[PDB]
Amino acid sequence: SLSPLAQRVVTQLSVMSASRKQPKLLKLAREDLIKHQTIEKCWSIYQQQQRERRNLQLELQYKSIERSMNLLQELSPRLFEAANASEKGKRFPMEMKVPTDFPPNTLWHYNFR
Amino acid sequence: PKIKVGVLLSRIPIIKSELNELEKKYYEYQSELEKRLMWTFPAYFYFKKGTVAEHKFLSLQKGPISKKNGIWFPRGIPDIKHGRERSTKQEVKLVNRPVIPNDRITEADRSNDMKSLERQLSRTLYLLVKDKSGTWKFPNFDLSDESKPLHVHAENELKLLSGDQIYTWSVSATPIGVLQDERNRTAEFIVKSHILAGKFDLAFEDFAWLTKGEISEYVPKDYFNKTEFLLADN
Amino acid sequence: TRITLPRRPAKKIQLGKSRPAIYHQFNVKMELSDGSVVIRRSQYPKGEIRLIQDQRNNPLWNPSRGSLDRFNKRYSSLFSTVELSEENKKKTQ
Amino acid sequence: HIWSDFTTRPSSLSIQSSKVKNYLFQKKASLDPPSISRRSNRIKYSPPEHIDEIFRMSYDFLEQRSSKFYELANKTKNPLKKDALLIKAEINNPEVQYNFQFNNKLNNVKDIIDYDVPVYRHLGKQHWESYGQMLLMQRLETLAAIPDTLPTLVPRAEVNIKFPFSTGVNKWIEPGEFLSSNVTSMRPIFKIQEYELVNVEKQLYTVLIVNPDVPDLSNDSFKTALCYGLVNINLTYNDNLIDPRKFHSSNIIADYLPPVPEKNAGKQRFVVWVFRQPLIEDKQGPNMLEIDRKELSRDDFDIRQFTKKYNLTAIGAHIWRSEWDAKVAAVREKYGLPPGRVFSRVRR
Amino acid sequence: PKSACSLVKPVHHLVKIDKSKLSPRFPELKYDKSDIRSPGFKPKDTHADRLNDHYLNTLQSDLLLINYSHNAAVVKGLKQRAWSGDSPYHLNRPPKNPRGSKAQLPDIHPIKWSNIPGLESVVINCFVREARENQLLAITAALQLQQITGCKPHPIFSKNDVPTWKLRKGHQMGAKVELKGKEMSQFLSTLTEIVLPRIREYKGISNQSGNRFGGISFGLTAEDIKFFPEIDANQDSWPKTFGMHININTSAQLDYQARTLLSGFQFPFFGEEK
RNA sequence: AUUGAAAAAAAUAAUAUAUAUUAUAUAUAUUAAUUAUAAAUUGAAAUAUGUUUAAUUGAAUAUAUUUUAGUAAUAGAUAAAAAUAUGUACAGUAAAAUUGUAAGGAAAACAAUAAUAACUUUCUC
DSSP: OOOHHHHHHHHHHHHHSOTTTOOOOOOOOHHHHHHHHHHHHHHHHHHHHHHHHHHHHHHHHHHHHHHHHHHHHHHOHHHHHHHSOOOTTOOOOTTSOOOBSSOOSSOOOOOOO | OEEEEEEEEEEOOSBOOOOOHHHHHHHHHHHHHHHHHOOOOOHHHHSOSSOHHHHHHHHHOOOOOOOOTTOOOTTOOOOBSSSOBTTSOOOOOOOOOOOOOOOSSOHHHHHTOTTOSSSOSSSOEEEEEEOSSSOEESOEEEOOSOOSOHHHHHHHHHHHHHTSOOOEEESOSSOSEEEEETTTTEEEEEEEEEEOSOOOOOOOSEEEEEOHHHHHHHSOHHHHHHTSTTSOOO | OOBOOOOOOOOOOOTTTOOOOOOOOEEEEEEOSSSOEEEEEESSSOSEEEOSSOGGGOTTTOSOOOHHHHHHHHTTTTTOOHHHHHTOOOSOO | OGGGOOSSSOGGGSOSOHHHHHHHSOSSTTSOOTTOOSHHHHHHOOOOTTHHHHHHHHHHHHHHHHHHHHHHHHHOOSHHHHHHHHHHHHTTOHHHHHHHHTSOSTTOOTTTSOTTSHHHHHHHHHHHHHTHHHHHHHHHHHHTOHHHHSSOOOOOEEEEEEOTTTSSOOOBOOTTBOOOTTTTSSOOEEEEEEOSOOOTTTOEEEEEEEOOOEEETTTTEEEOOEEEEEEEEEOOSSSOEEOTTTSOGGGEEEOOOOOOOOBTTOOEEEEEEEEEOOOOSSOOSOOOOOOOTTTSOSSSOOHHHHHHHHTOEEEEEEEEEEOOOTTHHHHHHHHTOOOOOBOOSSOO | OOOOOOOOOOOSOOOOOOHHHHOSSOTTTSSOTTSTTSTTOOOOOOSOOHHHHHIIIIIHHHHHHHHOOTTOOOBOOOOOBOOOSSSGGGTTOOOBOOSSOSSOOOOBOOOOSSSOOOEEEEEEEBOOGGGGTBHHHHHHHHHHHHHHHSSOOEEEEOOSOBTTTTBOSSOEEEEEOEEOTHHHHHHHHHIIIIIHHHSSSOOOBOSSOSOSSSEEEEEEOHHHHTTSHHHHTOTTTOSSOOOEEEEEEESOSSHHHHHHHHHHTTOOBOSOOO
């Protein structure tokens, strides 16, 4: 009927498939449904607020940069030129790592190079 | 007007941000909803039948109550496939050493040492400095030469202050903002830069590494208003 | 010639009744090369893993911070620089 | 805690069921849902875990938001803006959501869903837009009741009709239905549910049922026929069922003549239109209007011309459509209309 | 059929009739997939995404600061050129195609607080070419992909036919999977930390790699896939293993911006940039 | 309905039952199912009845009665790989060329490549 390789392929396929592995549908009572809706809506609102806060902050930073660069242009042309360069190949430093869940054994390195 | 060089050193957080009380609970609920809706664990794949590893897994597990004729099941009749109650959430209990994570709060945090870099791990720390007067501020430097670029000059000044303990990285040549005033006809162009690996430790009397919330307490109100948005909240 | 698994009649998923594939996943703790632990959701059943070769001990990811090995092991008593100076006459080439 | 206060706020924003309210607001998931009436089913049921504390937090968050909105709402002077503020404050209230979703909107009981309350009215409008309004629009376009009678419609009020007096059975007419001559023998009953903010005391309405498809053999085309015409009707958000109780004999510009389609004349559209009166300033009370009853004719009726004359704006519409059956002759006889014509089966 | 003449009739109202809502056929389908009442419901925001949080906090501000060019105006792309009306044959003529390209190119905007570059989507294309012989290899590749991602793969089929390579048309050959949001972020984090350090001699992603507009890519050999922890935990379960292409799609205007963004997430870049 | 936990009711829709009308309506009750379907001397689980250990429950083990495992793809109204070529209903848009990417090369696969003025809703200064 089937080889051992064929069997193992079928098993692998099954791992991915939804055939006889999935539970019943999540039914709720009307009160429960409402509670869920209120949880979700509030959360969504909170997320929107956070986005606006961050977005606003970014806008403020941009405005400050603009204000700075105009001033620099007014005062010292050479300094302005130096500031406003193409940073095409700018690379973030490899020490600035993505913050983990829990910290390492040695928290901070005081010596380098 | 005199050109001056503001510098704020940003030590970035080394671990995840702490979740809000609202957030945590919501996340737990979503996890429990997922679990309820999650598929059966296909144990037949990961554990081969008639093997020592499977047997241990089986022992760890406890099976579901099957339907049996002539009995009342007041929580409905058991719906079972691959050995799981379809009507409910499934729980699957699982050098050779237990992975024990380190404490997120630190010794420095406990002591409240403001000069230390390990004192807050989930927040963005900013280098502040106290001058001859009682005021605090971000490191200022006089730009008399005006030959070199501004950010490079700032970095050099920081390095000089340190005695080559600090290891910084400028984010860009562009200045983030300016602090300006009429009494002293000057202009402090603020550079942004990131402490990567070193001490500071040292004209300025004292220094500290603080979050955005603590800087408000230390620094003046007008100054804070000028430079609030530059600092990250977390 | 072509090796295949021949298909059975497909099961009709009705419109609206299609359900998203939520695979069974465990919360797995990865301890990296150093003691920094990180939680990640994973399909394989293992609550804890500790890694040997990661970015946190690779030189490319932190610049600021086995025939040769075999040779070192089995010529260890001799201790094999001074040795280079001894065995490097540059007349003959 | 603004949503627990009912000093200034209406009673309708609360849930009237006590058990349901208790279930909503508890400190642990101990109680079982009032919705599940049966004991065995309650036993079987299991709500999702951790739902209570998070729900409470969400309530607090949205309650705070509502309170903040109310701080603005009371300072506001202009009425539409104030209403919008009120809506914003209370729309995310769980109790009002429960009330609206799970109780009837058509024959709303005032204590549960009060359409005097702005939030509930907004909810009702949204519900109407979701399905019933779209359906009505489709039936107007497909059947060709818009361009044939009255150019366009901008649906504002939800209009539902009924024929209670003829047969006995209770049924709201779905737009574009085929009704028997027995069903539509006696007059219908309207319900004009208004969702916009409008002056309830001043605003009058007119209702016109028009039959565009009565055949005119001189023209070799069709003509309109005003089958039923009411004017100067007073509506209120909750008190809105236009019945012989409400309107007087003075309000009837053309009293109900029934659908009596001729044999082979075809299917005849009867499309009720609901207009609101023009509102005059510097005049307290409801501004009436006089209709020249000799000028307007029933056997031929320019609806558009009539609208132009009295400065009406069509807010709502509904439509049924009748064709010939055995009982139309009986209906004619009852009303004292003539025998009724019979046309050739072929449209030659 | 009396005719094939398609001709949509105009309407006499501005209300937008959603035809799906007027039916009673698919009541479960009227609910949004986000709604709990739909069978298509899935808990989306299950836990706090770590890479995304990092981007929000540290990187995004830094990226904005980098990308500020003073009084930078919009650079319009290559577009379809109109004809000068110096002849009456230009009058209903289709426009001249773009200058260099046949297809039109997008406008490059200055980076401000709104349009900062960020990760948009990851796609993991695995086309196993031995599966022209063996269909079961495609299945195994799909499983591997699923294991790696925690996301449902979609089967790739042979779209073309060719004799030199023993390839038919309409044959299942490997699989793909578009990751988005939190799963994608996790996959990137795993790539940065676990897998790409265990490749022995890897300098980086090439600087000559990428789209012209905010898309960067690279590929992993069958040797490299054995470092993924789901694969890594058991060598025995996976005798065979298949390479893969990894298309990273950013919200970057240009490719150097996208490269910079990826560097922020600890991706090393080695080659000489364009 | 009995069982668990610690007076009632007020949508839609479905189901059950009843009746109203030359009206596929209304009334009351209740919220099921939702990816399954025969056939397994062999795997796994439960319950019942025994026996032994630390009246007791856990733990171990025997028999009986069941339940699961036949492990197989679409999970989306799918949308230019291949497949039902006539009906109807609903919805969408192709191709080429270009820039890239593990074996991949001119030629296998995947990604990306025209413009947002005005409008509606949401959050926010």
